[PDB]
Amino acid sequence: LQFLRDTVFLRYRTRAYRRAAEKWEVAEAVLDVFYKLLKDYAFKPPGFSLMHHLLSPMLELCLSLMEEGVTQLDTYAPFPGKKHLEKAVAYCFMLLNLTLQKENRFMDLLRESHLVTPLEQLLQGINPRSKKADNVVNIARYLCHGNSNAELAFESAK
Amino acid sequence: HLRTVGTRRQQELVPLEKSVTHGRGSLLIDMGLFMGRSFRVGWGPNWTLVHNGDKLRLNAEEDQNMDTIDYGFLPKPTSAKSTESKVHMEKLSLEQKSRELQSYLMPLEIELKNSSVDRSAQCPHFKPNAGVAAIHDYAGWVRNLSNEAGELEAVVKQWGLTWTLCESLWGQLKEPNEYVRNLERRKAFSHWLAHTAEERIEEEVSLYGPERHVEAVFSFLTGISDACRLAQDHRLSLLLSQMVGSQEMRELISLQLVDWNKLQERLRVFCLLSGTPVWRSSDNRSINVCSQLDWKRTLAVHLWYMLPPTATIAQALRLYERAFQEHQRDVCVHLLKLYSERQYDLCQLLDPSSVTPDYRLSWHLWMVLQALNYTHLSEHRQGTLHASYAAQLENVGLWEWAIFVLLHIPHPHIREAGVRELLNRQCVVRESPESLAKENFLIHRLCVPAQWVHEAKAIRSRRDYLLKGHQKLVTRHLAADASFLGELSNPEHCKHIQLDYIRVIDMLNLIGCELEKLHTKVMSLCYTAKDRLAQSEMAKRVANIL
Amino acid sequence: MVSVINTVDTSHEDMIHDAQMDYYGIRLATCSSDRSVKIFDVKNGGQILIADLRGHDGPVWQVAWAHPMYGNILASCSYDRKVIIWKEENGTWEKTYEYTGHDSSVNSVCWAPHDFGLVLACGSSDGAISILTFTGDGPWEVKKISNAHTIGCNAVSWAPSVIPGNYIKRFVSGGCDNLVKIWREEDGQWKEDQKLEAHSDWVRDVAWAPSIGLPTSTIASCSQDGRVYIWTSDDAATNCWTPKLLHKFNDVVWHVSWSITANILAVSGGDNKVTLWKESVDGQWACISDV
């Protein structure tokens, strides 16, 4: 799990540098992996560590994706790119929503386990980060509203 | 009871061992999580404990394979191990190879024209004849043609020199006729010695000259007119021409010059014309030369000057030989020692002779000498040794010559029972599978005539037919063959041998199937076998349908 | 000690006791301490498994292929007190017979030279050897020798088939009493022709070298003392076995085997190493090489 996630963020910059079509696909694969991780969500401590990993650079990456989406609405289509890009956007939307309901129960439990302190910091530091920084996601939502293509709009409103 | 007590002691040790293991788990137990840096532990002991349990007092102790297995090989080895791999993929080439190179088919074939054989109603034999002459010719022409290649080098030259010192000397030494024969042997050996100490004196003495300084004058003398011309010491020049002269000049010039020097690259020249260069410790010059020069270079001096009596050359040679000492394996040297010998005494030196031998040359050498009467070799240990060496040489397809030798060697029997077994192995299957062509027929032809062809063919069939055997089991074969000519041949073989019911059925077939079955039943009277016959008939019907 | 030796040798990969090549060099039967008799095939130098004949309650010790004149037969003995004979009928590697006539472990097996018939000799750790003789069908009659060796038998080796040209066969075996007993058989029963005491401890293995047609029959033996002796008979029919020391190692020698042509001894034992030995032209044995 560590190897793939590390590769994927690096590749996304790597994907962008070479071949827009092939970078996008890698990003879509990463989004799929994230979705799988969400579905999946000693052992409890490992889960807490994973939650901590999920909650600053990773948060920024989602923001970068949102910025790409804001760029995206204006130009391209590119449906195959759009599906993968669209799918990635949907995954980003869903993970925060799916994660948040899970996260509040999850984070408190992690804190209880800590009675670990660093992971708790994620509860503290992670919470501060979440508010954002709101604008970039919001712009993407506005673009989705302008598009009126459906979907994306639900995840944006939720 | 003692063993039981030891087990009781062994059992106690095990309990102690168990306690120690428990302590290790107790002391070594490691519990880091979720993920922790790895730490040392006695992980290995647990793994060894299971093995010890599998091995399991006295019994377990003397029941643990020290390794522990040994693999025995025929032609030739196999592999084995236990163990760093337990098989080795040997790349053919490795160490031993000189023997193989020396025994390149030809070293055998050529010798076969000379050996001859006794053709009879069965296994033949061998015969002797101008053996020496034969060996001389082959070694001659062969050696000459060999003196032209492009690889190895050093090795080839050494081999050639050894062969020349072996066969050469042998022949050279196989009332004025004795005087003339010694002059002729001395004449052949002299130049021979020079050629031997060549290349070494060749480029070597070359530089020596084109270099500096003295000594060379002595080295040219070991090689005379060109040396004198290059040197051109007027008085020394006249004395130098007395070399090659066995004349009683020796003593005079010897002592007188030494005395003159005492009263007062020249004394060494005088030591040579004295004719006793090394054994005369009085001059103390040509012994001390042993560190400087090859033993072969010092031999050449003895052979060339030792003295006019044409036997004294060999004398002094043997001398300097048994003389050297620094602080055995020189082949070319050991041939000289063999040559310097006389005969008889067979009971010791005949005994290192085996050392030397231990391949094909040694065999041929002993055989010619024994047959010729010059050296009656003997007999069974020497033959055992030749037999494995010849078999090692077959491995790569040396079988026919070895078989012939085995037949001739005997003796007078028992060997045949072994040679026949070897032939059977040779054609058990692979013989029948590798011979399935034209390569087998020639080999079969080559071996001394015997009715061994049917025997080899039959073995091949068994591994993988009835007609070949002719040239219960037969019934089974008939059932499989529920082609026609072969079946007829099998029937003929059965008749020759004379299942009776089956034979009757076969006769009926030769003369329908149901009638044959009835005949078989009648034969049985005067059934699983019947069922088998029915199955064979069904198979035949299937074949007909196909 | 033994524990120290075990510590020194961790074992890179699982281990096996004995493993013998087939006649014709096609197959390679093996056995290990896991009770499993694996038959591999070696076509072109590559090892390929064909069957895992499982069936022993204890670790299999030694293994021996029968002569191909009787079809394809392989026999293996074990610490379970039993000996198994596996036949082959079209790839049908089934056991056609099983023998359980010894009360303690069976250290070794060996097949009589193919002329004598299909005789299998077997030495137990009870101190008894059981020999199985083949008849017409699946019956096997046993000729048992009780109290052959004092505290048990480790090695069994057949004398080469020597034509009297009315046939006499001699077999010599080693055991844990230090004695290398030879054996003589008449009408049926086997009697000890002679004892050979030169070892100072348990005889491990005893190999009767194949005669190169040569009448100077030799036998090799190795023991817990760490000595290897090459006992010799100077002539036919003279009850003189004169032992000669090959070498002594500070550690035990486990196994000894004769190479066919040159009479090279493969000495397995001591330091996990196996040595190769040839008798020189001088009668002293020398080590050719380290494997």
Author numbering:
A (entry chain A): 733 to 773, 794 to 807, 810 to 869, 873 to 915
B (entry chain G): 213 to 268, 271 to 296, 298 to 300, 303 to 391, 399 to 447, 450 to 458, 462 to 493, 501 to 563, ...
C (entry chain H): 1 to 165, 177 to 302
Give me lines lifted from the publication on this model:
In this study, we report the SPA-based cryo-EM structure of the entire CR subunit at 8.0 Å resolution and the SPA-base cryo-EM reconstructions of three overlapping regions at average resolutions between 5.5 and 7.9 Å. The final average resolutions are 5.5 Å for the Core region, 7.1 Å for the Nup358-containing region, and 7.9 Å for the Nup214-containing region. Notably, the assigned top and bottom faces of the Nup43 β-propeller (convention of Wall et al.) are opposite of those proposed for the human Nup43.12,13 Two copies of the Y complex are present in each CR subunit and are named inner and outer Y complexes relative to the center of the NPC. The inner and outer Y complexes within each subunit pair up in the same head-to-tail fashion; eight pairs of the Y complexes interact with each other to form a closed ring scaffold. For each of the two Y complexes within the same CR subunit, the stem is sandwiched by a pair of the Clamps, suggesting a stabilizing role. The EM density for Nup205 or Nup188 was assigned to two molecules of Nup205, not Nup188 as previously proposed. The two molecules, named outer Nup205 and inner Nup205, interact with the short arms of the outer and inner Y complexes, respectively. Outer Nup205 also associates with the stem of the inner Y complex from the adjacent CR subunit.
